[PDB]
Amino acid sequence: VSLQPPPQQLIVQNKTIDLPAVYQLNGGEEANPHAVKVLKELLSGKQSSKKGMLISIGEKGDKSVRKYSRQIPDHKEGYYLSVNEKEIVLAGNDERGTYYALQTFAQLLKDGKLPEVEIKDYPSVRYRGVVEGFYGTPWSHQARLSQLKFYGKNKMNTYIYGPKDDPYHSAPNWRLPYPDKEAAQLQELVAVANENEVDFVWAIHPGQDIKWNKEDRDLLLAKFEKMYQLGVRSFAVFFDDISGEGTNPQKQAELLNYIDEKFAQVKPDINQLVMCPTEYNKSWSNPNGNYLTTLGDKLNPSIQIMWTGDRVISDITRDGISWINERIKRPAYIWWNFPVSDYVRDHLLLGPVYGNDTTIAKEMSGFVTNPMEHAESSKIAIYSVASYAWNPAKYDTWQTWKDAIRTILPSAAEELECFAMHNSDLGPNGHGYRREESMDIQPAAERFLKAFKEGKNYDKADFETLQYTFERMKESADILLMNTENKPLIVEITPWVHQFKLTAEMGEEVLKMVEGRNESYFLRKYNHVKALQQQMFYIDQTSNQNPYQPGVKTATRVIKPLIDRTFATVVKFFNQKFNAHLDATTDYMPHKMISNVEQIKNLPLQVKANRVLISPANEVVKWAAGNSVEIELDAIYPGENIQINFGKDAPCTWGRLEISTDGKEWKTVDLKQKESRLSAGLQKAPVKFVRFTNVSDEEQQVYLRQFVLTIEKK
Amino acid sequence: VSLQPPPQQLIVQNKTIDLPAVYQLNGGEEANPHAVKVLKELLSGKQSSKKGMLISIGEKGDKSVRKYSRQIPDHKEGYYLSVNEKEIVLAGNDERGTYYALQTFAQLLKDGKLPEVEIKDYPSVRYRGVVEGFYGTPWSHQARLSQLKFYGKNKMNTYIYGPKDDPYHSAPNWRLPYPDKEAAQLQELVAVANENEVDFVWAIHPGQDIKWNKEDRDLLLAKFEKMYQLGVRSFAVFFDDISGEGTNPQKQAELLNYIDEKFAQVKPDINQLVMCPTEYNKSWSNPNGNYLTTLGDKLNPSIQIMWTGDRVISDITRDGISWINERIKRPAYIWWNFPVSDYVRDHLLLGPVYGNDTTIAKEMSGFVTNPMEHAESSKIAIYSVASYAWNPAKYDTWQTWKDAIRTILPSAAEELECFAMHNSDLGPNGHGYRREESMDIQPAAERFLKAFKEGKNYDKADFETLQYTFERMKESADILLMNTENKPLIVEITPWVHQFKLTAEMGEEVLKMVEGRNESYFLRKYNHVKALQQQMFYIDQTSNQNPYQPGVKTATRVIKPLIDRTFATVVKFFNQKFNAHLDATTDYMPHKMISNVEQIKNLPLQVKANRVLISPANEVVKWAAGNSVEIELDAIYPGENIQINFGKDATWGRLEISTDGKEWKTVDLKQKESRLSAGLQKAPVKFVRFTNVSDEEQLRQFVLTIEK
Numbered sequence A: 001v002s003l004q005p006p007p008q009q010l011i012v013q014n015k016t017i018d019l020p021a022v023y024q025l026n027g028g029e030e031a032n033p034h035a036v037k038v039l040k041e042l043l044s045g046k047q048s049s050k051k052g053m054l055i056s057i058g059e060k061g062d063k064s065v066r067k068y069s070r071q072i073p074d075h076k077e078g079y080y081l082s083v084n085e086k087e088i089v090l091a092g093n094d095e096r097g098t099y100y101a102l103q104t105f106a107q108l109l110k111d112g113k114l115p116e117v118e119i120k121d122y123p124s125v126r127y128r129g130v131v132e133g134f135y136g137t138p139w140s141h142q143a144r145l146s147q148l149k150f151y152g153k154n155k156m157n158t159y160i161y162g163p164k165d166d167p168y169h170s171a172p173n174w175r176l177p178y179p180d181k182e183a184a185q186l187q188e189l190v191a192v193a194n195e196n197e198v199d200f201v202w203a204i205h206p207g208q209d210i211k212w213n214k215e216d217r218d219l220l221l222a223k224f225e226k227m228y229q230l231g232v233r234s235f236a237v238f239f240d241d242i243s244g245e246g247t248n249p250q251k252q253a254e255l256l257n258y259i260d261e262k263f264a265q266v267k268p269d270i271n272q273l274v275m276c277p278t279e280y281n282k283s284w285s286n287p288n289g290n291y292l293t294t295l296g297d298k299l300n301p302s303i304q305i306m307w308t309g310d311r312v313i314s315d316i317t318r319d320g321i322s323w324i325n326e327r328i329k330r331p332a333y334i335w336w337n338f339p340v341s342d343y344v345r346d347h348l349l350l351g352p353v354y355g356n357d358t359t360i361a362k363e364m365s366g367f368v369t370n371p372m373e374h375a376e377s378s379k380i381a382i383y384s385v386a387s388y389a390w391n392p393a394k395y396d397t398w399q400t401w402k403d404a405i406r407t408i409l410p411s412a413a414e415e416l417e418c419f420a421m422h423n424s425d426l427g428p429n430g431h432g433y434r435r436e437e438s439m440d441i442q443p444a445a446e447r448f449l450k451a452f453k454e455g456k457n458y459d460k461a462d463f464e465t466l467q468y469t470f471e472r473m474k475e476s477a478d479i480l481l482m483n484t485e486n487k488p489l490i491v492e493i494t495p496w497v498h499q500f501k502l503t504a505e506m507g508e509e510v511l512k513m514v515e516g517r518n519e520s521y522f523l524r525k526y527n528h529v530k531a532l533q534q535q536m537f538y539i540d541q542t543s544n545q546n547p548y549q550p551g552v553k554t555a556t557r558v559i560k561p562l563i564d565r566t567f568a569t570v571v572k573f574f575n576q577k578f579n580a581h582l583d584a585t586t587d588y589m590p591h592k593m594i595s596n597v598e599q600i601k602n603l604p605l606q607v608k609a610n611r612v613l614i615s616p617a618n619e620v621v622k623w624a625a626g627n628s629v630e631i632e633l634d635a636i637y638p639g640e641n642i643q644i645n646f647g648k649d650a651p652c653t654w655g656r657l658e659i660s661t662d663g664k665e666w667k668t669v670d671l672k673q674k675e676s677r678l679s680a681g682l683q684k685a686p687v688k689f690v691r692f693t694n695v696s697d698e699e700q701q702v703y704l705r706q707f708v709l710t711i712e713k714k
Numbered sequence B: 001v002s003l004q005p006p007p008q009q010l011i012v013q014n015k016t017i018d019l020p021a022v023y024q025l026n027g028g029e030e031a032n033p034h035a036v037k038v039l040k041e042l043l044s045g046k047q048s049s050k051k052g053m054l055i056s057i058g059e060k061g062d063k064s065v066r067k068y069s070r071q072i073p074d075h076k077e078g079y080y081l082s083v084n085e086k087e088i089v090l091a092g093n094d095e096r097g098t099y100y101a102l103q104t105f106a107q108l109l110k111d112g113k114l115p116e117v118e119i120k121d122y123p124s125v126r127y128r129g130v131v132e133g134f135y136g137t138p139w140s141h142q143a144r145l146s147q148l149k150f151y152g153k154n155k156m157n158t159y160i161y162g163p164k165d166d167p168y169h170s171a172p173n174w175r176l177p178y179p180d181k182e183a184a185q186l187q188e189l190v191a192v193a194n195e196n197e198v199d200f201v202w203a204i205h206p207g208q209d210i211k212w213n214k215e216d217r218d219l220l221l222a223k224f225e226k227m228y229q230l231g232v233r234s235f236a237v238f239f240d241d242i243s244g245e246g247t248n249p250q251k252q253a254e255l256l257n258y259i260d261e262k263f264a265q266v267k268p269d270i271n272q273l274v275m276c277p278t279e280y281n282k283s284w285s286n287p288n289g290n291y292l293t294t295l296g297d298k299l300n301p302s303i304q305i306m307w308t309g310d311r312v313i314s315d316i317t318r319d320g321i322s323w324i325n326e327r328i329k330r331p332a333y334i335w336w337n338f339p340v341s342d343y344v345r346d347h348l349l350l351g352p353v354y355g356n357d358t359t360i361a362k363e364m365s366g367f368v369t370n371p372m373e374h375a376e377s378s379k380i381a382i383y384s385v386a387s388y389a390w391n392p393a394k395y396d397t398w399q400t401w402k403d404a405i406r407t408i409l410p411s412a413a414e415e416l417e418c419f420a421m422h423n424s425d426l427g428p429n430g431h432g433y434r435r436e437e438s439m440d441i442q443p444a445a446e447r448f449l450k451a452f453k454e455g456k457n458y459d460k461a462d463f464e465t466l467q468y469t470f471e472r473m474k475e476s477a478d479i480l481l482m483n484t485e486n487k488p489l490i491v492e493i494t495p496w497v498h499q500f501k502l503t504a505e506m507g508e509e510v511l512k513m514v515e516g517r518n519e520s521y522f523l524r525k526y527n528h529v530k531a532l533q534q535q536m537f538y539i540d541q542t543s544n545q546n547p548y549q550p551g552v553k554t555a556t557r558v559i560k561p562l563i564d565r566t567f568a569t570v571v572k573f574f575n576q577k578f579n580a581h582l583d584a585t586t587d588y589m590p591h592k593m594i595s596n597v598e599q600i601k602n603l604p605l606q607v608k609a610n611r612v613l614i615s616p617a618n619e620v621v622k623w624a625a626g627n628s629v630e631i632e633l634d635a636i637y638p639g640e641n642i643q644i645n646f647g648k649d650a651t652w653g654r655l656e657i658s659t660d661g662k663e664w665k666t667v668d669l670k671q672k673e674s675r676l677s678a679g680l681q682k683a684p685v686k687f688v689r690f691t692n693v694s695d696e697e698q699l700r701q702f703v704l705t706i707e708k
């Protein structure tokens, strides 16, 4: 909170110094000009004189800091920083070290005053930064310019450019030079990266269609030469998430070594050469171990090999990094898949960075984070990874999280903390990765509520905590929506902020239902909750409409389940007490589904874009002779298709699929095998009802893997 | 409540019958087919020749109702209706009367049961309905189809088509036939009006550019002939809100009498011929009286003359209607300018219909309402005007308002009543017309506030009344936003519903600030209120951005002033108690204005469209040498111009402009008497500064225009 990342060595005195009114600057002409520019901005409108306070800036060896050469740590990007009443020393082991001394100096400066301090500092991990490596909308040019400035402040020296959906990076145009517009933007990003002491690493992802021939080898080197002409001085080749011949480890190694020997080692000034393997995590690695040992043994040793840990999404352990390092014969260059949300695109991941061993710096060549498509939102994790990677031995997860939020939005830090504390879990996903959320209120929640489902009074304080939490959520939502200090951050999170405010309002009303003294008041709160459920549906259908995980989920771990369970319970109790028939459903769904199949009838419908689907069942479905499922839409729509998967990859001989506009006249629609599932085209036929009946004489055992109606788009 | 409009005569027997499952029908082939259709749609049940209670429907003179013919009122659009255990009688004096008996019958039918009742009914006023006569976006075709159905249900027999901004209604394209698309739509509206027993009156507004020559007379008759070909059988000529020769009353009377003699009396089946005068209200009319006496004397007696009362916007009184009737020599055809909002377009006018004398039915030929451009929202007033015009003697302002709301939105009637109660006043306007709002809570508001300000303890009940109001306002806002029973109503009102919810949230937080508790809690509520002010500002600057009264105002008469005064007061008390410097400003302003001049520095900035201006002062214009007024916009914008006024003819001020507030460019002010002005030719602008660069010391206007 004093300093981020925290220095390796810091000795502070209880004496403070004034940023001097008058200063003699020694070394300004010879020290790293990027560092000298930061110094001059910090000394703006102070007197530069041949007899003021001495400020010494330089790299080790420079006349200006010869005197302190014994104090400068002998580590790449290391520096010595000194403030006393006599003078200030800003001494890099190298040019980047001098820049980093200034990034520390800048944080020490509190309202014209400096602490009396001795700092010897350097990074524990050699390469630290970000891989823009996710699926989805690449970062905007303005977002990237903002990222590079943020990296320089937090001593991250690496930006690996590799957005999966950039067609000049991957499938299908990796062979083509960037068009003039994009090329000019990349040239500007490279110049800005250099000015912030960041290595811009341009990656290529050629594996899905690469031929192991001269034509494609030359086009890959020609593309690298064009990027070099734009100023790029670090390069990567990625072979992740591909199939086919491009997965051949001997050919991958031969290509990387060719690039090394004919390009990387021939230019005077290429820094990093990095490759991402096809087997990039332990789980998806073939047990013969031959893929990874082939790379380890054949790839030139200066070449970096990236690794995501024990699974596609995982935290880095001592055992896990030892496992990879033994096979690739060098320290892994970690690709950490957090806070990347490209497989949970309906969630923001704004929680702290944790889970990575703090003792394994010597076992890694580098550590980069793959972030969200929300660039500013990712700064919380990026700031935290910068801190971890520079000084893992002192890494303080929770304080660093707070420091990041206070850095990103000083004007509304407590509101951003409130929002982030309840927007940190991923929810259930195919990669199995979860994070903690709402941990502080969870105990007051669990027993305000296991009690309610059974027992007694529950406690005036597990009610004031939940009421307080909803009140704080609304304050935070409304202040964040109107915040003008980081407009790009507010644009990213706004849809979630809307949903978060509605969650908090629904909670306040549901608690008013629990407090409910008379029937009339209770019905008013009930009707209000039903309206808030509808509003949350409409935000979910109109916000963040991507093809994969459309819509907006928030406060999913603890708060939404507490509110939904408490509403369903208080409604059950009202129905019992007043012999009423109030609907206890917690998610608004305008369409209806009925079944006499035990394992289907309680599955909720979901709307995703122009799809209306039955939530897939985990359990074996027992489908009796004559039993059926029927969907009723809220209106007649033109139909596109129906897709069904029963887990058989075979024709469905026993089932009759029908559509209707009135649920009186039915038209049979023929299911055809398609891509291992069943599909029936509807050819724009009007549909309001969909019905599937077991017309055989026998019970059928299936899984409800998929049951989806697609209707004509708005 | 049970019937709208309430019938002239009603006897109820506090006995019930089941709607007959099996019934016999007499007069189905003889009666108004529009009436027979309504009946058959109500009769869930099987027609028999031999079993079940008898239903008789017909007009006076039909054999089906001969038995009941002396019970039928001898009035145009009159009817007799009877329900007992033995039979149901639906007997019109004329075909429209039979349709009206069915519109009363439909209202009696409750959960498959009818009351035993005898009704004799007829309208007190001959022509009753709506003039779509406002400035602004004309009603959509779908809105108009909905309107005509509602008019038939409420016994409104007149729809006057005359949207000021329809180019084929007004100048110059009143001369041109409607394009094919619009013609086909108007032909459909006339057919639907006819199916709902509504007279479609097509108006023309030719006066701003009319030549009193053969060419324009013929083009007007050719236009009426084309409308007649689309089915129109009633016509109007409007001469309101024009200047020039078209205001000539002798030429107006000659043209209307020519229309009457050559067209209205030549066709076999024209019904209404109506004119709206240039002098259409008492104040606007010539003190010498010649204009109105010319019309009264010269207009053929069958021609109706419209009147809006004592003012452009006014309620109709016995003295008012006597004053006009004496001059026009016939009963005035009232054009009532409510709930028209075309001069207060930032307000919805959803309150009750009141202020019109209930004893003057014999003094008016007609009564039509001019509504809002929000068609569905206008149905509260339209329903109430239908009730008033049919039976003024029994007109119940508040019960009719509640009945309208429960008819329009039965699924959320209490929520619509909550919204409408607090969205009824117009606010200050050039026409001086106001309405009551929030009258329920006004006493608690006035007490709570009177107390709180001069440090006495407020009643717990009154705090509770205000807390209850804000709570109900949020419930209503959230239920209305999601209501699907009247989607078009919810589209019209949605911007106001958003502003209404923010008002209620702001109220709730301002009351939590009054409850006080501890310093850190107060600061949290304070900061929440400032965010809600900001959100209201953004709705007001981005919704309903029309050229006249942009934005969205709600709960303006009582609730927003209460909340804003309570906020400013609790912040004054907190600042004193903690020597804090919290801002007590109630309107968010994204721009900053810093001045070391006295009577200036505390004047709030205002944003309206692409204008940023200092609020003019009615105080001391005293300005020391070297002093400056400086405005800091929230960003750089292309400058359009600056206008400055001090109120004198006259070289002491330097107007300067900047993107950074360090590098300053001078701008020279041109001069036309009092008006100081300078175009900025799209110059970047973030800071504006006006310094006194004189030896000596020294605000009607200080207005920067930027590009949007």
Ligand SMILES: CC(=O)N[C@H]1CN2/C(=N/Cc3ccccc3)SC[C@@H]2[C@@H](O)[C@@H]1O
Pocket (backbone or CB within 6 Å): A133, A134, A135, A164, A240, A241, A276, A280, A308, A312, A335, A337, A340, A342, A343, A370
């Ligand atoms: C090196 C690396 O991390 N590559 C990828 C891995 N991954 C994903 N891959 C999709 C996948 C689907 C099915 C099975 C395995 C992997 S999703 C998240 C991330 C994605 O951001 C990233 O570029």
Ligand SMILES: CC(=O)N[C@H]1CN2/C(=N/Cc3ccccc3)SC[C@@H]2[C@@H](O)[C@@H]1O
Pocket (backbone or CB within 6 Å): B133, B134, B135, B164, B240, B241, B276, B280, B308, B312, B335, B337, B340, B342, B343, B370
């Ligand atoms: C017959 C009739 O009511 N005509 C008009 C009057 N009026 C308005 N006129 C604007 C005006 C401005 C200045 C001086 C006098 C009148 S605004 C409301 C209404 C407008 O709907 C209506 O068509």
Ligand SMILES: [Ca+2]
Pocket (backbone or CB within 6 Å): B030, B031, B032, B058, B059, B062
């Ligand atoms: Ca008849």
